[PDB]
Every structure is written in structure tokens, then in C-alpha cells.
Design a protein around this motif. Sequence first.
Motif, PDB file in Angstrom:
ATOM      1  N   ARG A 137       2.066   1.755  -3.457  1.00  0.00           N
ATOM      2  CA  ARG A 137       0.993   2.251  -4.328  1.00  0.00           C
ATOM      3  C   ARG A 137       0.864   3.791  -4.153  1.00  0.00           C
ATOM      4  O   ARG A 137       0.708   4.511  -5.138  1.00  0.00           O
ATOM      5  CB  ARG A 137      -0.362   1.584  -4.010  1.00  0.00           C
ATOM      6  CG  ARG A 137      -0.364   0.058  -4.164  1.00  0.00           C
ATOM      7  CD  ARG A 137      -0.923  -0.416  -5.475  1.00  0.00           C
ATOM      8  NE  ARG A 137      -2.286   0.076  -5.739  1.00  0.00           N
ATOM      9  CZ  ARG A 137      -3.403  -0.551  -5.408  1.00  0.00           C
ATOM     10  NH1 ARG A 137      -3.361  -1.701  -4.748  1.00  0.00           N
ATOM     11  NH2 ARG A 137      -4.580  -0.031  -5.730  1.00  0.00           N
ATOM     12  N   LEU A 138       0.963   4.281  -2.910  1.00  0.00           N
ATOM     13  CA  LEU A 138       0.878   5.715  -2.676  1.00  0.00           C
ATOM     14  C   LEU A 138       2.098   6.419  -3.272  1.00  0.00           C
ATOM     15  O   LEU A 138       1.955   7.510  -3.848  1.00  0.00           O
ATOM     16  CB  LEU A 138       0.753   5.978  -1.191  1.00  0.00           C
ATOM     17  CG  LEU A 138      -0.587   5.553  -0.625  1.00  0.00           C
ATOM     18  CD1 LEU A 138      -0.513   5.495   0.878  1.00  0.00           C
ATOM     19  CD2 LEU A 138      -1.698   6.564  -0.995  1.00  0.00           C
ATOM     20  N   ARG A 139       3.282   5.818  -3.172  1.00  0.00           N
ATOM     21  CA  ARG A 139       4.479   6.383  -3.776  1.00  0.00           C
ATOM     22  C   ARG A 139       4.298   6.537  -5.283  1.00  0.00           C
ATOM     23  O   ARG A 139       4.640   7.576  -5.868  1.00  0.00           O
ATOM     24  CB  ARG A 139       5.622   5.432  -3.477  1.00  0.00           C
ATOM     25  CG  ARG A 139       6.940   5.860  -4.097  1.00  0.00           C
ATOM     26  CD  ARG A 139       7.927   4.745  -3.898  1.00  0.00           C
ATOM     27  NE  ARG A 139       9.216   5.070  -4.472  1.00  0.00           N
ATOM     28  CZ  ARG A 139      10.134   4.182  -4.797  1.00  0.00           C
ATOM     29  NH1 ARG A 139       9.904   2.885  -4.636  1.00  0.00           N
ATOM     30  NH2 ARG A 139      11.292   4.576  -5.283  1.00  0.00           N
ATOM     31  N   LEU A 155       0.843  -1.204   0.000  1.00  0.00           N
ATOM     32  CA  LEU A 155       0.000   0.000   0.000  1.00  0.00           C
ATOM     33  C   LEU A 155       0.873   1.246   0.000  1.00  0.00           C
ATOM     34  O   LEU A 155       0.570   2.182  -0.728  1.00  0.00           O
ATOM     35  CB  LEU A 155      -0.925   0.009   1.225  1.00  0.00           C
ATOM     36  CG  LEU A 155      -1.858  -1.201   1.365  1.00  0.00           C
ATOM     37  CD1 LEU A 155      -2.762  -1.037   2.561  1.00  0.00           C
ATOM     38  CD2 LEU A 155      -2.701  -1.460   0.096  1.00  0.00           C
ATOM     39  N   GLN A 156       1.962   1.229   0.755  1.00  0.00           N
ATOM     40  CA  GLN A 156       2.886   2.349   0.777  1.00  0.00           C
ATOM     41  C   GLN A 156       3.455   2.613  -0.606  1.00  0.00           C
ATOM     42  O   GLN A 156       3.513   3.759  -1.064  1.00  0.00           O
ATOM     43  CB  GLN A 156       3.989   2.019   1.770  1.00  0.00           C
ATOM     44  CG  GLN A 156       4.937   3.155   2.034  1.00  0.00           C
ATOM     45  CD  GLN A 156       6.080   2.705   2.871  1.00  0.00           C
ATOM     46  OE1 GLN A 156       5.904   1.969   3.841  1.00  0.00           O
ATOM     47  NE2 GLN A 156       7.239   3.246   2.590  1.00  0.00           N
TER      48      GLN A 156
END
Lengths: 25, 26, 26, 25
Positions: free
Chosen positions: C16-18, C13-14
Motif C-alpha cells: 500500500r505504501l509502495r 501494508l508495504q
Amino acid sequence: NADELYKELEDLQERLRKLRKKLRS
Amino acid sequence: GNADELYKELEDLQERLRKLRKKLRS
Amino acid sequence: GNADELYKELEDLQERLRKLRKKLRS
Amino acid sequence: NADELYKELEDLQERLRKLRKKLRS
């Protein structure tokens, strides 16, 4: 684009809900 | 309790994404 | 292992945000 | 706006990194 970004945000939100359901299980 | 604290933190992140979606529509 | 599996899922998820941040700049 | 949205995404990304650091601790 706002729609691509929106779809990605909703998929991340659903993944968090599913991880929370797993924490409960 | 670690699991309960993680559950709440993930709920906060989920709610932040819910609100970002609302801001994108606004 | 639950903690290791949760750590990896949060890393995804981290990441994906990056990548979303990169798309916003692109 | 793209900049407000960007700042929020980065703060969520940092929160996930911090939760992962706590899982490791």
C-alpha cells in the motif's frame, strides 16, 4: 491529493492498531 | 520478547502515520 | 500460522505504501 | 510537502520490509 492520501494513511494506521490488538490477543 | 518487540515497532509505525496525518493538515 | 499471517499482512501494508508513493509521483 | 511525505512513506515501507525479514529469521 492530500485528502486521498490522508484517508489512506488513516486506514493504514487503523490496520496497524488492529494488528497490535491481535498480537495482544 | 519477539511479540512485545514487534508490538512496539508497529506502535512506532502507527505513530509515524498519526504524525504524517497531522503534517498534512498543518 | 500467526507469523505467516502477520508476514502477509505487513506485506500488504508495504505494498500500500509502495502504491501511495506511485500516486504521489502521478 | 509531497517530497517530505514521499520520503517518510518510503522509510515506513523499508521498515516493514525489515520487520518481515526479521519474521523470516
